[PDB]
Design a binder for this molecule. Structure first.
Ligand SMILES: *[C@@H]1O[C@H](CO)[C@@H](O[C@@H]2O[C@H](CO)[C@@H](O[C@@H]3O[C@H](CO[C@H]4O[C@H](CO)[C@@H](O)[C@H](O[C@H]5O[C@H](CO)[C@@H](O)[C@H](O)[C@@H]5O[C@H]5O[C@H](CO)[C@@H](O)[C@H](O)[C@@H]5O)[C@@H]4O)[C@@H](O)[C@H](O[C@H]4O[C@H](CO)[C@@H](O)[C@H](O)[C@@H]4O[C@H]4O[C@H](CO)[C@@H](O)[C@H](O)[C@@H]4O)[C@@H]3O)[C@H](O)[C@H]2NC(C)=O)[C@H](O)[C@H]1NC(C)=O
Ligand SMILES: O=C(Nc1ccccc1)c1ccc(-c2cn(Cc3ccccc3)c3ncccc23)c([N+](=O)[O-])c1
Ligand SMILES: [Ca+2]
Ligand SMILES: [Ca+2]
Ligand SMILES: [Cl-]
Ligand code: NA
Ligand code: NA
Ligand SMILES: [Zn+2]
Length: 802
């Protein structure tokens, strides 16, 4: 109950929202059915529309009008945004040449440049070029300011997850808004776009920018607008707040537009009906910039023009139905559409079984347009698992498609021609970023980056300390003229041991066997002391950022950091030049595993465990195929280079090591490779401690990795070889799931050349993802600036076309 018979007189769009049952006048009162009786009349004025005309110039103030063209309007802060143009012979902001903003040019009393976030729903990245003829204001922001060719959304590429990721710097799994629709089993409550439960604060985790600001003494305009408040009024409200006295004026504001998304759903991303919505958004930007200029704030405010996700062509006929796969369709609840999430209809049904549901959805039709996953098997780059609100069974749906439970769901719910929600690597889901103002760079293009990074930068723009988040603070320093954040490298926590020869062959009883000169005996000794190390360890050794016990092991062809706790390398580093040759494993060495006399039997793996474990086989981190000489090849068979591998995974690994590394070395002019194991049994994206390992090689303390990574580095200038590179680096990485079957790849019974590379591409990763997963910190010794290295570590190679 609201006693809606109070009044909004002098309270219109008040910044502090008042406590029930007193009636509200804030920009969300409408959404809560709680505005005072006179809110429309006083606050949502519309008389005479939104623009000054010649005949209104110098009029007598009529308080009924939507905006004013009277003489006192500048001092009142409530002129129509085109007042000065119509009535004072001023030019529109868009018709002015752009001029570098070297320093903020702000009215007296401004403590810092204000930040205005202009967010547009469904603004696909290619709109910038394809709609450029009809978006002159946006194109001026873009060309004069700092812009990226696109910005990567988070998964799922829906509205609520992405806007809240913008506001927090957190993955949906950590902020809790994991879709537009959700069930939380602890609350036993549901969250929907329509309705009331979404207003409950217990859904919304992390700390959004407006709270970060408030807590640190920076005032914030309210970021949300009820849908029925028109755009022109949102802008006028913002411009009015900007006229408040110094002590009451916010420093951060957000505008939100539901366009072009709303139209895109109806007409497709490029439907001829889409030109008008883009025209109208541009007009709104025009109104803001003309209003800023009137207030002399156009060379003072930083403006961010940012989308939440793109939009793809999707029609009702491109719907796969679970009823064409499942006999038990009525025992499941599906969250449908551009992604699938499946749970049991009833928790009292103990005959519901996820294993058989997944199997019934796996590779059943030759052109199947979705792929089922247990959530923990999804590509790590999606970071979509560590939340009770994300169902165990997930469907990644092909771009352009929908998944639904039964055909009745679709035609008793063709309406739509566009949708979004797909994998955040998909080109059509990419969205936009432009920054314009004193704190951004002038006429600068920056590479594409992820939207999880923006919260840090918005905090920098406002002089705030960001709450803990998933951005990498400093990776977007290149966007900024000043206010950069100067990060330092994390301190190494554990220093390595450097063991020499300490054990005799006969002290080992591992059940391993192998069939195995003064010039070349000083030679082998120097290699084991680290003579070739500057060749194979190009960027310094990775730092270990947790407490552990490990050894550096040097060899002719590779260097490793060997964990005495996990009984295998944390990392193995090696360089393959363009000229290197692939050889095979000689017949007499096929099953060769050799004790490592630098490492105690007690801290080694044993061959007996693998013999006994009928499920588990083994692989090598440094590939024997790429040994530099028949004699160096013996190093590759050391028990300290060995890692546990399912036979099904060995097909993947062997193809990567035998074929792909050489291919990349040819294409990239040498590559440096760092590979290793990852353990993430609780799928939180973070390195497991030993007591978290759920699986071991049978009868042993050899822990089974959940994933294997590789980081592949070369020179960005591919005319220079990887090992002699004078400038910026180029990287691609992956985190391959360590699985006992290849069910994920529907083509796996074919030659590895038909499916393996496709799988690796799907599991492409950022170096930063691998950092979280291993507690390692890479690129410690380069000639590059740290901010540049941070940008490199956030890079994702996506394998989409242009
Ligand atoms: C992306 O960035 C984020 C943010 O930096 C990273 O997430 C952080 O990771 C930390 C490590 O996992 C985690 O730290 C833990 O916090 C516990 C206290 O948590 C509360 O307080 C914080 C701070 O205000 C708050 O943010 C939390 O909010 C979560 O939970 C509420 C409701 O449940 C949600 O509204 C909200 O969305 C958020 O949920 C998300 O995080 C939680 C984990 O906290 C997940 O479970 C959810 O699924 C969801 O993703 C909380 O309100 C603290 O209690 C923990 O301490 C335990 O572990 C330590 C290890 O040092 C141990 O020493 C302690 O003894 C303690 O153990 C005890 O509890 C155990 C569990 O019950 C039990 O097993 C033991 O036996 C002990 O009794 C821990 O320090 C931090 O909270 C989150 N923050 C956020 C915002 O998510 C994230 O990792 C980054 N991702 C990547 C890939 O890098
Ligand atoms: O209009 C809408 N839906 C809709 C309903 C009916 C018809 C058509 C569209 C609609 C949809 C979303 C939002 C929204 C704004 N912010 C704040 C914000 C965050 C980051 C950067 C800018 C701003 C959010 N933060 C988290 C989640 C959602 C939102 C609003 N909103 O303004 O509150 C309205
Ligand atoms: Ca949206
Ligand atoms: Ca973990
Ligand atoms: Cl959803
Ligand atoms: Na075995
Ligand atoms: Na298969
Ligand atoms: Zn939408």
């Amino acid at each position: 109950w609201t006693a809606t018979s109070g009044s909004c007189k002098g309270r219109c769009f008040e910044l502090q929202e008042v406590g029930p049952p007193d009636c509200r006048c804030d920009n969300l009162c409408k959404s809560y059915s709680s505005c005072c009786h006179d809110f429309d009349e006083l606050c949502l004025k519309t008389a005479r529309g939104w623009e000054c005309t010649k005949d209104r110039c110098g009029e007598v103030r009529n308080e009924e009008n939507a905006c004013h063209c009277s003489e006192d309007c500048l001092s009142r802060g409530d002129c129509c945004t085109n007042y000065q143009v119509v009535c004072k012979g001023e030019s529109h902001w868009v018709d002015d040449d752009c001029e570098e903003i070297k320093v903020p040019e702000c009215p007296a009393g401004f403590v810092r440049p204000p930040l205005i976030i202009f967010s547009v729903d469904g603004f696909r990245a290619s709109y910038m070029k394809k709609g450029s003829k009809v978006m002159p204001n946006i194109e001026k922001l873009r060309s004069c300011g700092t812009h990226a060719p696109y910005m990567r959304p988070v998964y799922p590429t829906k509205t609520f997850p992405n806007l809240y990721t913008l506001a927090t710097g957190l993955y949906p799994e950590s902020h809790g808004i994991v879709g537009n629709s959700m069930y939380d089993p602890v609350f036993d409550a549901s969250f929907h776009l329509r309705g009331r439960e979404k207003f409950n604060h217990r859904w919304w985790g992390g700390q959004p920018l407006w709270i970060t600001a408030t807590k640190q003494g920076v005032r914030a305009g309210t970021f949300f607008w009820s849908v029925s408040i028109p755009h022109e009024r949102r802008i006028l409200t913002i411009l009015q707040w900007l006229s408040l006295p110094d002590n009451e004026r916010p420093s951060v504001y957000a505008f939100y537009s539901e366009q072009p998304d709303f139209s895109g759903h109806k007409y497709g991303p490029f439907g001829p009906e889409m030109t008008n919505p883009l025209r109208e958004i541009d007009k709104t930007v025009g109104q803001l910039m003309d209003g800023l200029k009137q207030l002399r704030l156009h060379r003072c405010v930083n403006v961010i023009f940012v989308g939440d996700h793109g939009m793809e062509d999707v029609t009702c006929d491109r719907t796969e139905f679970l009823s064409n796969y499942l006999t038990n369709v009525d025992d499941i609840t599906l969250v449908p559409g551009t992604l699938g999430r499946i749970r049991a209809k009833s928790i009292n049904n103990s005959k519901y079984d996820p294993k058989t549901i997944i199997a019934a959805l796996t590779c059943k039709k030759p052109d199947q347009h979705f792929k089922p996953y247990m959530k923990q098997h999804l590509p790590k780059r999606l970071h979509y698992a560590n939340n009770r609100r994300i169902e165990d069974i997930h469907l990644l749906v092909d771009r352009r498609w929908h998944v639904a439970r039964k055909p009745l769901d679709v035609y008793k719910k063709c309406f739509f021609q566009g949708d979004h929600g797909f994998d955040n690597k998909v080109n059509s889901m990419q969205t936009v970023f432009v920054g314009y103002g004193p704190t951004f760079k002038y006429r600068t293009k920056v590479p594409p980056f992820e939207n999880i990074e923006l919260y840090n930068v918005m905090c920098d723009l406002l002089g705030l300390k960001p709450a803990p988040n998933n951005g990498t603070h400093g990776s977007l320093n290149h966007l900024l003229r000043t206010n950069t954040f100067r990060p330092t490298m994390p301190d190494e926590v554990s220093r390595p041991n450097y063991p020499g020869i300490m054990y005799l062959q006969s002290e080992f009883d591992l059940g391993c066997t192998c069939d195995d000169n003064k010039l070349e005996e000083l030679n082998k000794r120097l290699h084991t002391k680290g003579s070739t190390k500057e060749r194979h360890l190009l960027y310094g050794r990775p730092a270990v950022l947790y407490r552990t016990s490990y050894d550096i092991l040097y060899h002719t062809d590779f260097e490793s950091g060997y964990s005495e706790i996990f009984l295998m390398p944390l990392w193995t580093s090696y360089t393959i030049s363009k000229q290197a040759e692939v050889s095979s494993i000689p017949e007499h060495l096929t099953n060769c595993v050799r004790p490592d006399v630098r490492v105690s039997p007690g801290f080694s793996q044993n061959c007996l465990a693998y013999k006994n474990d009928k499920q588990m086989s083994y692989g090598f981190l440094f590939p024997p195929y790429l040994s530099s000489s028949p004699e160096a090849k013996y190093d590759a068979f050391l028990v300290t280079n060995m890692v546990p591998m399912y036979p099904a995974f060995k097909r993947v690994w062997a193809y990567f090591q035998r074929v792909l590394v050489k291919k990349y070395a040819s294409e990239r002019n040498g590559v440096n490779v760092i590979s290793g194991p990852i353990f993430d049994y609780n799928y939180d994206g973070l390195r497991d401690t030993e007591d978290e390992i759920k699986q071991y090689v049978e009868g042993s303390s050899i822990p089974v990795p959940t994933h294997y990574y590789s980081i592949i580095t070369s020179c960005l200038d591919f005319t220079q070889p990887a090992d002699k590179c004078d400038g910026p680096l180029s990287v691609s990485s992956f985190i391959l799931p360590h699985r006992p079957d290849n069910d994920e790849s529907c083509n796996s019974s074919e030659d590895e050349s038909k499916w393996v590379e496709e799988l690796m591409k799907m599991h492409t990763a950022r170096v930063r993802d691998i950092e979280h997963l291993t507690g390692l910190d890479f690129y410690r010794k380069t000639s590059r600036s740290y901010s540049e290295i941070l940008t490199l570590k956030t890079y994702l190679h996506t394998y989409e076309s242009e």
